[PDB]
Amino acid sequence: KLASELSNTFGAISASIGDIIQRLDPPEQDAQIDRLINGRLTTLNAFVA
Amino acid sequence: RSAIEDLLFDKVTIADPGYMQGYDDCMQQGPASARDLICAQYVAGYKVLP
Amino acid sequence: YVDVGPDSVKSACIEVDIQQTFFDKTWPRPIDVSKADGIIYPQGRTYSNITITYQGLFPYQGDHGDMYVYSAGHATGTTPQKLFVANYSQDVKQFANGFVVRIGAAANSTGTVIISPSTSATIRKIYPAFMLGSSVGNFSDGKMGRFFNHTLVLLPDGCGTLLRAFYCILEPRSGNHCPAGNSYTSFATYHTPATDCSDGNYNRNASLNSFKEYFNLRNCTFMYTYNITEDEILEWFGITQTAQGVHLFSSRYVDLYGGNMFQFATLPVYDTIKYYSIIPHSIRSIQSDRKAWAAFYVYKLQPLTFLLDFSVDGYIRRAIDCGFNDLSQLHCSYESFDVESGVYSVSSFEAKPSGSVVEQAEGVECDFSPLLSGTPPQVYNFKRLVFTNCNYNLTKLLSLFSVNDFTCSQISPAAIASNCYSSLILDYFSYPLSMKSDLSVSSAGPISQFNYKQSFSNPTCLILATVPHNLTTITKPLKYSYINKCSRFLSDDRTEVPQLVNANQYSPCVSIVPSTVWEDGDYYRKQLSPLEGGGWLVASGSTVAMTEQLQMGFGITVQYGTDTNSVCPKLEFANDTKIASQLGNCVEYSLYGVSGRGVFQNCTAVGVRQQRFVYDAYQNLVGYYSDDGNYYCLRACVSVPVSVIYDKETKTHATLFGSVACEHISSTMSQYSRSTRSMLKRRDSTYGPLQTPVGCVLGLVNSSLFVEDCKLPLGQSLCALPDTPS
Amino acid sequence: NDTKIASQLGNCVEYSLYGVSGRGVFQNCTAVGVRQQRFVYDAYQNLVG
């Protein structure tokens, strides 16, 4: 489950941070990354529980 | 161990544990046919404790 | 402007000689965060003896700083002579979000005179002087460090009891040994204690006058002064810049013993500081009367998180830089200065990947020459170019038109030029600037209702531009025009239903509408057959007057494929190294525009051929068929987990690298998991790594003891027995 | 021409301190450092005094 979630975009423009960085202007770049981070943190929380 | 325990272990399908070492079987210095999720933990930051 | 005081009298200046080789000293001062060295107190708040975590600008714990020492100048016999100084005037630094300093740190001790170091004079505190600004450059003699426009000036003046500060424009002087003169060497300032600093009248303008000797004040916009009293005890001070202007901090004003710095003052200036330098100074004192001065230190600020140990009197007494060590990380994880003993995981090594290689192209230059001629289409007549297999330089294409609007969505405007793709697609049309409110990917205008729509599954950009007068092969429409209606009447002649345009497709009404709209408000209709389901097709349009130079619009989109990614920017590969083999570290790569990072292996092949890229069930690349005829497998990369063994009873530690093997480990490493590992090195600088059945370790020593309860088991039969107990 | 409300000893009466505001009870007590930092706070940024 943790492995599959590494590919799980949350509606973020890409599942990869480096890919988001090379594709976006920084004002949008971190919006996409924040969205991606929140879902990744959420899978960790569920996992621990 | 025992004949029973070894029969059990052969019937069990679990992937081999690391720690001595199998790091080079994640790497190019080992078989190209490895498909272990055990080596994939290096990407995820996942750690298997001994 | 500001009342600067009197104009300097001499055009001439005292000669300045560079004596920098005399000034090397080995007195470095690392930050002791457990003494709260260099800590800036938080603004507007105080705390009880509870401890907290905080983030803000601080010096890095391991930084020993930059050190400078002020000295007496040339004097001989019974009189003052030349200004023998250090080469500090040439030391331009990039501003680094402020800095903090130690002043007087070597006080109540001894050192040397340096310029005449055999004297071995005792050392005393001297206040530093500084200059800051947005630009630097050469003096007319090619000398380093000239500042431009207005600059900050901070200097003690005469005795250390007076401090002055300015925001002014420097004025060069043409006299002998002065900045506009061609006999200039280097800027310096001086104090002459034989007549300066009388005990009945300290000379408050002494250093100002020697400053003015080389640079006349002109156009000064700010001035401030402050009152100070002497104290040989070490002082902390610092400067930062914010959107509220520059601010000054000192420990002297509030915390003489703890050393915490408080914001002593603020400045109105909003000019960004891009450069920083220390102003050289010298004492004019007589050769038998010389006095050595205490060393000065400076440390750059960084945005770091720290544990802070507040005292009940609110002074921070101890602190921990979270980033300094994995041990420090452990303390920050538990928000405390004493973590319970145990074995704990810490972050993994990054594995030092190799600089990039590529497999991009072969291909031909993208033929963008259709854009060079003819009349571009009315918006419902679009012409499209699609590129595959080719190399390009779009900035050369862009040079041919003047662009009055370049915007993009889902891609930076720079990245659409630099990314490699399966295709490059361009749509173009005539378009007056008068209509520009209706051209956006989100527009509700009739242009988007019936003439064009853009999908959001592909990144896109838009260009509005005009044609230069030297592009004579470009021609223009009699009027700009568009369709403002496209609907079908119901066969019963009352109800009617609109036909909105499909993304990236022509509207159906183009089949009845004329190639241009002949008159504003023209409309046409077509009866439809029973095979067509009946009704009447109806369409109409509008026009805009032609202009002296043609106005144009473009839509640009891209498509990412997998093995079809042959459109790329022209290669920069010339004058580089052979690719792609290294084998080697897990090198960064791009293959046909597919970015990634990883290590390859020259193994066999798996099917199926000509798909290039190979993938797993988790959408991760598995490998690639090289065009050298060998399949290469991709193993992406590996990392090394780290854990620590901490015995708080003795306050000692050791570490474990797990399955990495000691064949990949050495007494120092650079991959890296932490900026330093020196806390292990305190004992382990003298020992090789030791392999164990759980993993390679540092500092555990094979004693082969047998103990029934380790209190720090490593699993299996392994034991991390402590060194003999406290 | 006023009631002189600069302090109370006190009451949950709403307060404003140089633009900081809330409601609460005040009572003269020992001093804690750092003096002249005005607002003493806990780890959750609740004003202490």
XYZ file of N, CA, C and O in Angstrom, chain C residues 524-592:
276
model
N -26.419 33.399 -42.668
C -26.799 32.442 -43.695
C -27.554 31.274 -43.080
O -27.461 31.021 -41.877
N -28.297 30.549 -43.903
C -28.988 29.381 -43.389
C -28.984 28.233 -44.384
O -28.942 28.447 -45.596
N -29.052 27.014 -43.860
C -29.125 25.820 -44.687
C -30.259 24.911 -44.255
O -30.331 24.513 -43.095
N -31.129 24.530 -45.184
C -32.145 23.555 -44.815
C -31.456 22.227 -44.631
O -30.583 21.881 -45.428
N -31.879 21.434 -43.662
C -31.215 20.158 -43.481
C -32.123 18.998 -43.867
O -33.340 19.048 -43.672
N -31.502 17.984 -44.470
C -32.152 16.762 -44.949
C -32.647 15.895 -43.801
O -32.155 16.026 -42.681
N -33.617 15.000 -44.042
C -34.065 13.968 -43.119
C -32.913 13.038 -42.717
O -32.869 12.569 -41.581
N -31.924 12.850 -43.608
C -30.721 12.087 -43.284
C -29.896 12.793 -42.190
O -29.318 12.147 -41.315
N -29.922 14.134 -42.218
C -29.329 15.032 -41.218
C -30.200 15.223 -39.948
O -29.798 15.942 -39.032
N -31.396 14.614 -39.905
C -32.352 14.763 -38.811
C -33.252 16.009 -38.887
O -33.992 16.287 -37.941
N -33.204 16.751 -39.995
C -34.088 17.900 -40.186
C -33.614 19.195 -39.528
O -32.512 19.280 -38.979
N -34.481 20.203 -39.576
C -34.198 21.509 -39.001
C -33.446 22.405 -39.978
O -33.276 22.044 -41.143
N -33.044 23.589 -39.509
C -32.245 24.496 -40.341
C -30.949 24.889 -39.664
O -30.955 25.369 -38.535
N -29.827 24.733 -40.344
C -28.601 25.234 -39.761
C -28.625 26.753 -39.888
O -28.972 27.266 -40.949
N -28.232 27.483 -38.848
C -28.183 28.947 -38.938
C -26.855 29.473 -38.404
O -26.385 29.056 -37.343
N -26.264 30.432 -39.103
C -25.022 30.986 -38.602
C -24.874 32.444 -38.969
O -25.445 32.914 -39.949
N -24.096 33.167 -38.174
C -23.880 34.589 -38.424
C -22.527 35.033 -37.928
O -21.872 34.315 -37.173
N -22.125 36.242 -38.317
C -20.809 36.731 -37.938
C -20.673 38.240 -37.938
O -21.609 38.971 -38.258
N -19.488 38.668 -37.516
C -19.148 40.065 -37.273
C -17.732 40.387 -37.709
O -16.900 39.489 -37.847
N -17.451 41.683 -37.923
C -16.123 42.060 -38.409
C -15.486 43.196 -37.616
O -16.170 43.964 -36.938
N -14.163 43.313 -37.761
C -13.341 44.365 -37.165
C -12.414 44.928 -38.238
O -11.843 44.180 -39.026
N -12.270 46.244 -38.279
C -11.431 46.877 -39.290
C -9.964 46.419 -39.259
O -9.382 46.184 -38.197
N -9.382 46.364 -40.455
C -7.977 46.051 -40.712
C -7.047 47.124 -40.163
O -7.448 48.276 -39.991
N -5.797 46.749 -39.907
C -4.838 47.671 -39.312
C -3.569 47.761 -40.159
O -3.319 46.897 -40.999
N -2.786 48.838 -39.951
C -1.578 49.120 -40.752
C -0.540 48.025 -40.756
O 0.058 47.730 -41.792
N -0.355 47.397 -39.614
C 0.491 46.242 -39.534
C -0.421 45.151 -39.069
O -1.326 45.400 -38.267
N -0.231 43.966 -39.601
C -1.083 42.864 -39.228
C -0.930 42.478 -37.782
O 0.181 42.412 -37.246
N -2.055 42.183 -37.154
C -2.029 41.691 -35.807
C -2.322 40.197 -35.902
O -3.118 39.777 -36.745
N -1.685 39.398 -35.059
C -1.824 37.945 -35.121
C -1.959 37.307 -33.764
O -1.484 37.832 -32.755
N -2.575 36.137 -33.741
C -2.615 35.395 -32.506
C -2.137 33.977 -32.758
O -2.230 33.455 -33.872
N -1.659 33.328 -31.703
C -1.230 31.950 -31.834
C -1.701 31.146 -30.642
O -1.742 31.650 -29.516
N -1.979 29.872 -30.871
C -2.247 28.971 -29.771
C -1.176 27.918 -29.850
O -0.912 27.381 -30.922
N -0.565 27.582 -28.731
C 0.477 26.576 -28.780
C 0.241 25.526 -27.742
O 0.001 25.843 -26.585
N 0.292 24.267 -28.134
C 0.162 23.217 -27.143
C 1.162 22.123 -27.385
O 1.752 22.017 -28.460
N 1.367 21.310 -26.369
C 2.325 20.227 -26.482
C 1.745 18.904 -26.062
O 0.813 18.865 -25.261
N 2.337 17.818 -26.551
C 1.903 16.493 -26.133
C 3.054 15.649 -25.669
O 4.014 15.442 -26.414
N 2.934 15.088 -24.476
C 3.933 14.149 -24.005
C 3.517 12.721 -24.374
O 2.404 12.293 -24.065
N 4.388 12.007 -25.074
C 4.154 10.609 -25.444
C 5.039 9.756 -24.571
O 5.561 10.250 -23.574
N 5.291 8.503 -24.956
C 6.300 7.737 -24.217
C 7.487 7.444 -25.155
O 8.533 8.092 -25.046
N 7.315 6.526 -26.125
C 8.387 6.273 -27.101
C 8.315 7.150 -28.357
O 9.102 6.959 -29.285
N 7.389 8.109 -28.382
C 7.226 9.015 -29.505
C 7.836 10.383 -29.256
O 7.660 11.275 -30.081
N 8.573 10.563 -28.146
C 9.101 11.887 -27.778
C 10.359 12.309 -28.534
O 11.430 12.466 -27.958
N 10.204 12.502 -29.825
C 11.286 12.915 -30.684
C 11.396 14.417 -30.963
O 12.339 14.828 -31.673
N 10.505 15.263 -30.463
C 10.653 16.729 -30.698
C 11.379 17.295 -29.561
O 10.894 17.222 -28.410
N 12.581 17.937 -29.717
C 13.255 18.432 -28.611
C 13.901 19.758 -29.044
O 13.894 20.086 -30.238
N 14.394 20.532 -28.113
C 15.239 21.681 -28.367
C 16.526 21.182 -29.021
O 16.940 20.045 -28.784
N 17.172 22.033 -29.802
C 18.431 21.633 -30.416
C 19.447 21.283 -29.341
O 19.533 21.948 -28.308
N 20.228 20.243 -29.608
C 21.155 19.746 -28.615
C 22.290 20.672 -28.272
O 22.882 21.324 -29.132
N 22.620 20.656 -26.988
C 23.758 21.341 -26.404
C 24.930 20.378 -26.170
O 25.893 20.732 -25.493
N 24.810 19.139 -26.671
C 25.758 18.046 -26.452
C 27.192 18.246 -26.929
O 28.089 17.558 -26.441
N 27.407 19.107 -27.921
C 28.757 19.384 -28.391
C 29.618 19.900 -27.232
O 29.127 20.609 -26.354
N 30.916 19.581 -27.267
C 31.865 19.931 -26.198
C 31.470 19.375 -24.815
O 31.463 20.113 -23.827
N 31.162 18.071 -24.748
C 30.780 17.437 -23.484
C 31.535 16.084 -23.346
O 32.733 16.033 -23.627
N 30.874 15.008 -22.909
C 31.542 13.728 -22.696
C 30.727 12.605 -23.254
O 29.557 12.793 -23.568
N 31.339 11.436 -23.399
C 30.607 10.323 -23.970
C 29.471 9.859 -23.068
O 29.584 9.815 -21.841
N 28.381 9.504 -23.723
C 27.144 9.065 -23.110
C 26.648 7.736 -23.688
O 27.085 7.341 -24.768
N 25.694 7.067 -23.019
C 25.213 7.379 -21.669
C 25.910 6.568 -20.588
O 25.612 6.746 -19.407
N 26.794 5.647 -20.969
C 27.361 4.784 -19.955
C 28.269 5.473 -18.971
O 29.123 6.280 -19.342
N 28.126 5.064 -17.719
C 29.006 5.426 -16.624
C 29.134 4.188 -15.744
O 30.197 3.573 -15.668
N 28.004 3.805 -15.127
C 27.846 2.550 -14.386
C 28.820 2.187 -13.246
O 29.251 1.034 -13.212
N 29.213 3.069 -12.313
C 28.856 4.466 -12.070
C 27.735 4.603 -11.047
O 27.128 3.618 -10.621
N 27.475 5.854 -10.678
C 26.431 6.271 -9.743
C 25.105 6.304 -10.437
O 25.046 6.217 -11.660
N 24.018 6.457 -9.663
C 22.691 6.481 -10.278
C 22.359 7.860 -10.881
O 21.366 8.486 -10.622
N 23.051 8.087 -12.015
C 23.076 9.304 -12.787
C 21.756 9.827 -13.304
O 20.902 9.094 -13.800
N 21.615 11.138 -13.199
C 20.437 11.808 -13.694
C 20.341 11.686 -15.202
O 21.346 11.666 -15.903
N 19.151 11.564 -15.722
C 19.082 11.414 -17.148
C 17.876 11.964 -17.846
O 16.810 12.153 -17.265
N 18.035 12.136 -19.150
C 16.873 12.344 -19.981
C 17.027 11.485 -21.203
O 18.031 11.579 -21.901
N 16.019 10.696 -21.507
C 16.096 9.902 -22.715
C 14.944 10.283 -23.531
O 13.816 10.044 -23.119
N 15.195 10.911 -24.677
C 14.103 11.395 -25.510
C 13.144 12.277 -24.724
O 11.939 12.174 -24.865
